[PDB]
Design a protein around this ligand. Sequence first.
Ligand SMILES: CN1C(=O)[C@@H](NC(=O)[C@@H](NC(=O)c2cc(Cl)c(Cl)[nH]2)C2CCCCC2)COc2ccccc21
Ligand SMILES: [Cl-]
Length: 107
Amino acid sequence: RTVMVNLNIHNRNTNTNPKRSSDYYNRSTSPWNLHRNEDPERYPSVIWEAKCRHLGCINADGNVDYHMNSVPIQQEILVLRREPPRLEKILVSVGCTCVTPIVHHVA
Ligand SMILES: CN1C(=O)[C@@H](NC(=O)[C@@H](NC(=O)c2cc(Cl)c(Cl)[nH]2)C2CCCCC2)COc2ccccc21
Ligand SMILES: [Cl-]
């Protein structure tokens, strides 16, 4: 039911320095690696998702504390998918945080 938009530089990645962000977040007690989620039937075709590096959280000494748990923060965002092969909502991991597990550790 919706119409026209211009796909250009104002709606695609122009960040050429991802290491600036990763070096900064690598100082987190719950740091993360990145999954390159590519789907050619989707706009952005590439979505970078956080994958927690550790099961526990990194302490002041540089060691892992297994009393805590590094966990993916989830968010729901909109993506365009090709119609015919349309606006779709998807759940994505946006980063990691350090939590005190109430029941189990998310692995
Ligand atoms: C690591 N990384 C990113 O995250 C990039 N972001 C995106 O390409 C796209 N957003 C994500 O993927 C994203 C959003 C959420 Cl919410 C999660 Cl989760 N993921 C973004 C591009 C611009 C249009 C809208 C989508 C930007 O910097 C980079 C540069 C080079 C290589 C990797 C990265
Ligand atoms: Cl890429």
